[PDB]
Every structure is written in structure tokens, then in C-alpha cells.
Protein: Ferritin
Amino acid sequence: TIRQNYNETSEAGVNKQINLELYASYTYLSMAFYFDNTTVALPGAHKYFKKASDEEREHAMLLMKFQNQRGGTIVLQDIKKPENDSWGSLKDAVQAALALEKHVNQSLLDLHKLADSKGDAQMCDWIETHFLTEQVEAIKELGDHITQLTRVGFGLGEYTYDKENLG
Amino acid sequence: TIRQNYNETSEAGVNKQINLELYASYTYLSMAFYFDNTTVALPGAHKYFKKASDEEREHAMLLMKFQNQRGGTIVLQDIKKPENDSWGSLKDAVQAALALEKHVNQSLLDLHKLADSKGDAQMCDWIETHFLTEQVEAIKELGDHITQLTRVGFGLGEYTYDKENLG
Amino acid sequence: TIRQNYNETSEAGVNKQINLELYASYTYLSMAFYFDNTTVALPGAHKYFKKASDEEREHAMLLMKFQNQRGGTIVLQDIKKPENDSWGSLKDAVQAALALEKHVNQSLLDLHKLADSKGDAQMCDWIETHFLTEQVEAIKELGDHITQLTRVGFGLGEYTYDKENLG
Amino acid sequence: TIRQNYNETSEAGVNKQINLELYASYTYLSMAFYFDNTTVALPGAHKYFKKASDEEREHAMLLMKFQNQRGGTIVLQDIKKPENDSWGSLKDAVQAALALEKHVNQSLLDLHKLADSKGDAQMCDWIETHFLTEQVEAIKELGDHITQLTRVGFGLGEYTYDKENLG
Amino acid sequence: TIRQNYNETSEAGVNKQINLELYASYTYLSMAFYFDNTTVALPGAHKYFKKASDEEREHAMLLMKFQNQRGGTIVLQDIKKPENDSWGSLKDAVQAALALEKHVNQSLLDLHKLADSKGDAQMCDWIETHFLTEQVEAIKELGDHITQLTRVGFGLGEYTYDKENLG
Amino acid sequence: TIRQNYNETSEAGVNKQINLELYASYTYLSMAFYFDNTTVALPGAHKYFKKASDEEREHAMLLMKFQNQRGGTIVLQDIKKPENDSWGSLKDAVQAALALEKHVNQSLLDLHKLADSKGDAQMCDWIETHFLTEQVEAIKELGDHITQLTRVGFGLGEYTYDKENLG
Amino acid sequence: TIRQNYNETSEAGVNKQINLELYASYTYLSMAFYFDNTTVALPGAHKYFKKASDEEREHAMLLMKFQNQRGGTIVLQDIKKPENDSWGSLKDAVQAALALEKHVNQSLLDLHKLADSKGDAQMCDWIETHFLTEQVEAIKELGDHITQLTRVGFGLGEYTYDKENLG
Structure:
């Protein structure tokens, strides 16, 4: 019996967060191959979102590794399909991604407000060390990608930011 | 308009196969972290299934890349959760995996019997080149893993095949 | 006598395909040196289409190598001049190449449907291995090039996609 | 005078934790040289527990380094002898270490709950950074070791997990 | 149970094809050491056919690997002795090898025609990938050998082609 | 809009803390060039404080980066001149630096106490990771410098500690 | 307008020479793969004519590059098929080659005599630099090839000069 100072409501939030980080992985993967369809054809975005889809997958496994470390149990659920089939312009996908990370961001803090509420000190710093700080930077990198894609404008500017920056 | 000699029923089978190869990726990922829970604690199996979950993910992207190459359109659906939460013994997971690959195997041939039926010659050899031959070997490697795990027996034999072979 | 299971009508479709792949190599060479004339002045397209003219010449030699391998005999015909002397904008030349590849694609499939009808199993896999999949990638890349040249537009965009992508 | 926001009760819990980490380093050293006696003869456990005794001695020096850093003063007490002279089978020693780590874990958390109560923000993150997560991994690995030593059994299995894993 | 979509009649043709490729490794072996007899003394042909005898042995093992991979059961029969104890001149042996490869070629296509009739798609491409194309090249090279051995003539030319080309 | 869980009062404390770390980079700069004046002539202290002046400048940029990362808005005020034009002896400067670091230390904890009161979890660990622990080490090293500068005494010892330790 | 001192008859004489070299490259290609057919099977001649086929293609692109450098316009006509389908013996192909190079030679001197009548001083030296001297060396090499092939005679001699010289 290795479980020590691990509430069962903190355990259910880890399962909820795992399914969430997998949902992001499955939306980015839609974005990535949306930019691969011949009617879009933005290769840099295809690479950029394909790494991002692989990185949100990393999030879920980390939370699955943590769940096993503390003594809980991984309870998986369905990964719902993304909320669109086409993602519009390059700006429109990045705007969609920002609101996704902001959703995951709030869910992570609520998970941290829950751990601090059950006095789960190790879970708090495990949330700080791996997620809280990484999430702000991703939002900031996204928020800086939107402002740039607005600047360059449609067309040649939309292509140039795909090759040079995301590629 | 790049679409040439690509039936729309061959297109729906690619979508069905993509969701399938993602279902396998999400079952292996359950197996992988099932073997990571402290009540199981078989590290070699955790690595072995974590690569396998990453490899079935490769299957889906390949079929998503193909879908975009021929001119179709990727229509994603929910990835259903695996059919168990605990996977029993190391033999029991490998037996479960074999019946999974055999399920994907039959679905791939049916997809190839469909393409040959619509005279889709390039899709047939794209199924031959990447999936048909790779699927038999995985089944054979699994069928050879079961027979070995039956030989070594429970306990020390179950651990030894985890470290030496899968690890 | 090396000829075995090589129908005589399968042998005529090979010579037809040889004269076809030489017509494409000779069309791209017109495109390549059209983009070299001082009134066009797009070097990346000149390089891009000069390698493609060499590559379709590779297609024909492969088909001539095969004809001799199966015991047939090569029968050359005239290489008709291209359908145009000037090829318009950079988008217009890529749209003509796409229209040309899709014709060669249909004739290869027709040649493959001809091989399977005569039970020429070895000829079928030879067309699978060297052309059918290579030809789908050729169409997908072209259709992606057109999508981008449409995005960047005329003027600076036509020069931009000429230097960075095609060259 | 360097002492700032360092409560005097936070200072006593540090000395208590120092004497605690020295008691663990001295218990593992008993275990390490128990597994070196000719009647046990398990070298991989001897090496494994001799590095752990050095590592808990590292814990205490970290806590002594911290005490001096915050302006406190180190007050040493006696290092009580371990609760046993012999430690039974290989599984029995790993189960005692687990029972020992979980005690040290509770005292670290108690020490952390003591730091947060006195608004000692820097002491809280110092306990987060060096111990809390390192201590969850120590418990998870031990509980995984017990699961395996149970699987392999006695006799050959107790020797096997001693040579390949612990050594 | 790994067997899936592997007809029992397709399994018989593999056992048959194994005994055939073994018959070809034993004929080339006879040819390889006929040219080593002091009354013949063509070392280049002794090297050439010995590699051929080792390569048709490879064929039998590839088919035996496939038989095990598809879940079947390898059934061996007698390897009949070659049809000649002496093989005449260098042209006469290469002409004999050409008639041998063409017999194996017809039995492979009949095996492939048997695989295609039972809908065994994987077996078909497996025969395509490893045999149908390799066999036509082996025949084409033997027919060219016969054409070149007829050009140089008997005597000196029969020695020259042995040293320079076969060796 | 990237701002999330970033109270407006927490934003004011960052602007304040930026102006503070700028005040510390401008005081150490005064100290660094006081020790360069010919009537002082302590080069090791001129090197030591110049690195300190560059390092507190780093602090201000880290806080300005964080202000932009969290979506806030950097507001700059005057950087007030230091409290002295001459800094006395080497002990007197290190004693002055210790009182400076302790002022910054208290304002950081008050900033952290402000971040904790608004539930700003990310800001708290961001202050933990980059400041709270770095600040206690800076203070501990200054107090040890004062203790060592008191041991060696004025004159020769005041020169020895400058060359060997600070330089 | 870059055109300067470039007559319009010299321009039509460059377009005629382009179609001539292209007819020469398409004849050598017929010769090369004629020597690849199994009833001929002369590998050294296949390689030799494939380089000469590729070499005469280079003549055509040099002239097209020249046509573009002088301000003109490339006008392409049909490349007529070679005058034979089978080329006889290796002596017979080199004799036909020599006659073809002598024809291109006179057409180049006629084009140099056409440029010298229009006072086109740069077109003269451009023909001298790239063609006139290369062509005489090509004619001297073919006539040298014809004298040797007659020396070695038919049969074994025709093979040896194929392997050793043309290979």
C-alpha cells in the first residue's frame, strides 16, 4: 500500500485531466491534418500542430504516470472528437487553439485549487513543476502567433508565417 | 481537383480505418499504463505497449495522409475507450492484443477487397505496401509471444519474459 | 526465349506508355526553358521543371528497360511537340502539368487494367511499384503547389513561391 | 543578521527532520551489511542498500545546509539504533524500507504544513523542490520492488531480482 | 490461433513451392561442382552457380518463414536429384538454368493465381514482393548470358566469359 | 486575450518589483565604480559588484518578461539614485548590500503573499522558482562575506579578501 | 529589350539546330535500348549510347539557353523518330552514328556560316566554343571506333570491344 496523503477527489480530477489532455491531442491532430488537405496546403502548420498534438499526448501520459505513482488508478473514458472538421484560416486555427489551452489552463488551476484544498502538497508542486508554468508560455506563444498572423494579413503573409515561423 | 479514380465508398473505409487504428492506439496505451500501476509493476511490458500504442497512432496518420493525398476528406469520430480497465496477466494482455490485431487485420482486408472492387489499383498497393504485410508479422510476433509466456509459466517466468524480451 | 506470360497487347500498351512519358519530358522542357526566357525570368521554376523533364525521361527508360526484360520489343514513334509555346504565369504552368500528370495517371491505370486482364501478375506489381503510387504523389504535390500559388497571388507572391519553394 | 521570516518552531522541525534522515541512513546501513553476512549472501541488495544509506545521509546534509542558510542553528541528537538486527528475506527488508520511507514522508509533510502555517514561503518551496516529489518516487519504486519480489517468489526468484534489478 | 484468411489449398502450394526451390538449390549445386571437376575446370562458373545454389536455398527458407508466419504447417518431401550428372558446355548449363527458372516461374504464378482465387491478398503481394519480380530478372539475365555465350563461341570465348563475367 | 487569473493588484506589485530590481542594479553599479575610484582601488570588488549590477538587471527583465507573459502591461517609473555616493570600506558595502537584499526579499514575499491571496498559483511558483530561493542564497553569501571580512580585519585582510574571494 | 546584333534568320537557324540535336538524342536512345534487348545483349554499348543520348540532350539545352540569352524565342517542333528500329551489329551502329554526327556537323557549319554572313560575331564564337571543336572530336572518336571494330572482327572481338572499351 503506497498511497499516502492522496484524496480520492484529487484522484478523480487526474482522470478528468488525462481525458482532457487527450482531447487536446485529438483536436491538434485534426488541425494538423486539416492543414495537410490539398485545399489548404500549409506544410509548416501541418508540422507545427503535429508536434503540438504529440505534446498534449505527453501531458496525458505524465498525468497517467503520476496517477500510478501516488497509488490511484487510471480510469479512462472516450476521447470526444474535435468541435470542428475544418479549421478555416491559419489565424482561425491558432485562435481556436488559444481558447483550447485557456480551457485546459482553467481546468489545471481548478485541479490545483482542489489539491491545495486536500492538503496534497506534493501534488501541488507536481502541478507547478510540469503544467502551470508550461501552460502560460504556450498561451503566450499562441497569443503572440495570433497578433503576428493578424499583421501579415491574408495570402502571402499567411503563407510566409507558415514557412518561416511554424516551419 | 486532384481526385482521380477514388470511389467515395473507398473514402468512407479510410475514415473507418483511421478511427480503428486510433482505437488500437488507445487500448495499447491503457495496457501500457496498466503495467505501470504499482499493483502490476512490469516495466518491460510498459515500454513494449507504449511503443505499440505509438505505432498504431502512426497507422492512423498514414491513413490520414493517404486520405489527403487521394483528394478525399478526413472525417473524424470519437475514439471509444478500451474494453477493459485492467488487463490481467502478461499473457492475458498479449492474448487481448492478438485478437485486437486480428480484428484490425480483417478490417484492412475488407478495405482492400473494397478497393479492388472499385478498381482502385493505387489504393490496393498502398494497402499492401504499408499494412497487409506489417499486420501479419505483428500477429506472428504476438502469437509467438503468447506461446512463450505460456511456457515460462506464472511468476518468475512472467517476470523474466518482461525484462529480457519485451524490455 | 525469355518471354513468358507477356501478352502482345500488354506489349503495345508499354510502347504507348513509353511514347507518353517522352511527351511529358518534352513538355516540361518547354516549360523549363519558357521560364528561362528573359520576359518571364523565374529561375526556381526553370530548375524545378528541368528536373521534372529529366524525371519523366527516367519514366520512359524504366518502361523501355521493362519491355526488354519481358521479352518484348521496343517500337518508338514521334514525340509530338507540346500543346503550347508559352505557358503563361507560374500558376498556369503548374495547372497544365497537373492536367498532364492526370492524363498519364489514367493511361497508367488503363495499362494496369490491361495487364490484370491478361493475367500478367508480374507486370501488375511492376506498375504498382514504380508508377501508380509515385503518380499519386506527383498529382498531390502539384495540386498543393496550385493552392499555394493561388494564396500568394501575382507579382511578389509569384516570385516568392518561385525562389523559396520551387528553387 | 541573515535570519528573515524563519520561525523558531520551523527551526525545531528541521533539526527533527535532520535526526530523522540520519536514522534512515543508519537503518539502511544495517540492511546493507545484513545482506553482506555470509548467512544471507545477496550482493545486489548489499549494493542497493549501501547507496540508499549514503543517499539518506545526503538528505540530512541538505537539511543541515538549509538550517545554516536560513540563519538557524543545528542541534544534533543521538541516532537511535535500528528497530532490528536481522532483516529477514529480501522482500521483508524492502517492506521495512517502505514502512520507513512512508514515515519520513509523513514527517516531511508535517514539516511542510508547519512551514506554510508560519508563512515561510521559501521553506515551503525548498521542501517541494528537494524532498516531497523525491519521496513519492522513493515510495513508488519500493512498492514496485515488493510487487516483483512477490511475483518471482522465494529461492531462485529472490536471487534473480537481487542480481538483475537491485544490482 | 494466428491463422486468418489462409486457405488450406494455398498452404499446400507453399509446401510444394518449398520442395521446388529446394530442388533448384540442389541442381545448381550439381552444376557448381560439375564445373569444379578437373575435366571441366571453369572456376568462374563454379563460383557463379554455387552462389545460385545458396540463393535458391534462400528462397525455400523465405517460403518456410512465410508458412510459419501465416499459421500453416511446413510439410517436407524428398528433394529429388537433378536431371543430369554432367551439364555439357557453359552455354548448355545456362540454357538448362533458364529452363529451370521458367519452370519455377510458372509454378509461382500458378501459386499466385491460387492465392488470388482464395482472396488471399497478403499472400499475393508477398509473392509479388519477393518472387515475381526477382524471377523475371533472373530469367532476363540468363537469356542475356545465353546470347553472350553464343556470341563469343566455344573455346577461348567460353573461357573469357567464365573469368570476366561469371567470376 | 491571454490574461487569465491575473489580478490587477498582482499586476501592480510586478511593476513595483521591476522598479525595485532596477534600483538594485543601479546601486550595485554605484558600488562597482566606487571601488574603481583611485582613492579606493579594490578591483576584485569592482568586478564582483559589476556582476551583481548586471544580475539584478536580469531580475528586472525576468519580471518584465513575466508581466508580458501574463497579459499585463509594464509601467515604468523613475529609477531613484542610490542612498550614498561613497560606500565606506569593503565590509560597509557588503553590509549595505545585505540590507539591500533583505529589503528586496521582504518585498518579494509580500508580492508572493499578494499572489497567494488572489489564488494566482502560477505567479506563486514563478516567484518560488526564480526569486525566493535565489534571494536567500544571495543573503546567506553576503552574511558570510561580512563574517569573513570581520575576521581578516582592515588593511591587508581587506585587500586579501578582495583579490582571492571577490575576484 | 535585350536583343542586339541578333538577326532573325540566325534565330530560325538556332531553332532548327535544337530540333536536330533532339533528333540525335532520340536516335542514340533507340540505339542504347536496342543494345539492351535480350537478342542483342551488349551492355557496354547500352551504357555508351545512353551517355551519348544524354549528351546530345545537353546540346539542345545549350542552344535553348543561347536562344534565350540573345533575346530570341524558342519554337519547338516534333522530334521525328529514328530512321531504324533495329541497328544491326555494333559496327553498324557506330557507322550510322558517324553519319549522323557528320550531318549535325555540316548543319552547324551552315549555321556558323549563316551567323558570319549577318556579322553576328558573338554567335560565331559561341558556336566555336561549344560545338565546332567538340564535334570534330566526336567524329574522330566514332571513326576510330569503326576502325577498331573492323580490326577485332565479329563475334568474340565484338564482345571484347563492348566490355573493355565502350564499357
About this structure: Chain C has five helices and no strands. Chain C touches chain G through 27 residues (CB under 8 Å). The CA atoms of residues 87 and 93 of chain C lie 5 Å apart.
